[PDB]
Amino acid sequence: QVQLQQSGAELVKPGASVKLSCKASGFTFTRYSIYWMKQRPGQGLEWIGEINPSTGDTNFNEKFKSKATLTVDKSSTTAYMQLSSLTSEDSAVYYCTRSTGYWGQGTLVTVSAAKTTPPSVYPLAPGCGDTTGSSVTLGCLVKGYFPESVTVTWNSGSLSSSVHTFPALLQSGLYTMSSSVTVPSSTWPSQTVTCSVAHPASSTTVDKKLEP
Amino acid sequence: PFGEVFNATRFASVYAWNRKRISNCVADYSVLYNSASFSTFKCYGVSPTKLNDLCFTNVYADSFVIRGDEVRQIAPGQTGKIADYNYKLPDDFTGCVIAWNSNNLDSKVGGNYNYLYRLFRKSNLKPFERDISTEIYQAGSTPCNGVEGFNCYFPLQSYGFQPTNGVGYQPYRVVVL
Amino acid sequence: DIVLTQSPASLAVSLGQRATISCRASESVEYHGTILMQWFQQKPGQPPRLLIYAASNVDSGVPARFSGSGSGTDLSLNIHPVEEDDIAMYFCQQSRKVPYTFGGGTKLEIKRADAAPTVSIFPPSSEQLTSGGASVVCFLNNFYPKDINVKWKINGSQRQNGVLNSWTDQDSKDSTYSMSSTLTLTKDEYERHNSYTCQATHKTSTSPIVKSFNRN
């Protein structure tokens, strides 16, 4: 099917440059113009600079200084955008889009001088006097990571219903988030539950087993 | 006369409406309204019971498949997508237009993408005209150059007939005279 | 640069009702017979998808429940039977003059009957203690409406310093809201007490809904 796989979740030191890739699949690369969009939490969507997969491109004077759009017509079928001299106003989510259908997953760029700290995962299981009930809620606390971008998955997807991903919070340069999952009480103490947290910005993945 | 038009196994598309001729033969416009259950027989000029008594090469049959909500567009003076962009009747229209539902034939689980319709055009269609152009319609000040995007749209859209859709979103089939 | 101003910024509607949002443009986004407006929908945590192109035309894969109307300078997006999955942000974007501009957005949330929060407390893992810290978690899941308040108690006394709260957008399945509260504290400051308590205050209960535990 039509797919726009973006890379990303990248920490970039202030003032450096970065190149975001977006690979296209399921459609002919040359028949569809490609647009790049910027979204910062707090601000709305901003600006559509386009590349015609056949030379031509057009930007916005607001980005006609930090944005350089190119593409590889060849087997890559990949559109690239290079962002130059990244200031703190440049950390955001950038999307590649096809003018029709879903946009790419979005690359989150974080421009900071901080060192990549991996997340610390902790299991949250009730114990010592819990009256069970028809169902039980377990959790995973993902604390002390940077930069933002963390994905928690329960039982590799077997527990996708009754899941809650709480947005992350920045308290002193580090991020903290939580995830909850509710399951029938007849299961968890018998059939085990495992939480798999993924940090792409550190290329790390940690799995924790919840036990009473 | 002939009946392989209405009893045809494959009907045309709106933007490519299929015309058929009939001459040097006899046509009985009365018993036509017998193999019927026709949901539409809109008629302008003379009644078919009276027109059963004369006949030039005027005998023309235009077949295609439209949208339910759009059957009202195959009528003189009407505007819209089909009238302006697919099949335009004149204002001197002297004939009849016959229609009927066909959801059990031209519908699919997952949509039927065979029937299409023109959605954009630089100018309205002159009466009795057939446009099969497939060029990227320039919507704004931009030459498109064989590439789609914001503006510059592909002009032919598919109906995607599903059975779960409503009667307006259901198929049909039209005639002419 | 046409300025796109959306109204309202936040619309609440009921299941099956009609929802309408409007977009004003400083200039006319019309050109030679077509209105160069687009409507995009971004569900919570998803990339935006194109709903409407050329102001009134619907893109493939978009249900007929969405419709586009308006003229030149004032445009409207309508949803005739609002379904539970429509919880999303809605952006209008123009394309008659480069640069292409977007609107401010419109968060569409869904009205439903009240729901009491299921509250669950969680002591700190024994291994966070080895790190020197101790974080007590409390989940308040599936509550409606959005308004909710949280009090942390310890040995009876209220604590308000090391408390951090996180909220979720409305769920596409429940139309409810969940919330997490973390009381972070030192392992040394944690062993100097016994009972910990998470109290929720919501429309559905005149009395605070309480979960608690003791360090024994």
Residue numbers in the entry:
A (entry chain H): 1 to 212
B (entry chain F): 337 to 513
C (entry chain L): 1 to 216
Original authors' sentences:
Here, we report an extremely potent mAb named P4A2 that can neutralize all the circulating variants of concern (VOCs) with high efficiency, including the highly transmissible Omicron. The crystal structure of the P4A2 Fab:RBD complex revealed that the residues of the RBD that interact with P4A2 are a part of the ACE2-receptor-binding motif and are not mutated in any of the VOCs. The P4A2 binds with RBDs of different VOCs with high affinity, and binding assays based on competition suggested that P4A2 ACE2 binding sites overlap. Overall, the composition and conformation of the epitope in RBD and the mode of binding of the Fab ensures that P4A2 interaction will prevent recognition of ACE2 by the spike protein and thus prevent entry of the virus into the host cell.
The crystal structure shows the electron density for the entire heavy and light chain of the P4A2 Fab. The structure showed that the residues 475–489 and 455–456 of the RBD are present close to the P4A2 Fab paratope. The residues of the RBD that interact with the paratope of the P4A2 Fab are 455Leu, 456Phe, 483Val, 484Glu, 485Gly, 486Phe, 487Asn and 489Tyr. The P4A2 paratope is made up of residues T30, R31, Y32, S33, Y35 and M37 from CDR1 along with N52 from CDR2 and S99 from CDR3 of the heavy chain. The residues involved from CDR1 of the light chain are Y31, T34, L36, Q38 and F40, and that from CDR2 are Y53, A54 and N57. Q93 and S95 from CDR3 of the light chain also contribute to the paratope. The area of the surface buried due to interaction between RBD and P4A2 paratope is 1667 Å2. Among these residues 455Leu, 456Phe, 486Phe, 487Asn and 489Tyr form key hydrophobic and polar interactions with the paratope of P4A2 Fab and therefore, binding of the Fab to the spike-RBD will render these residues inaccessible to the ACE2 receptor.
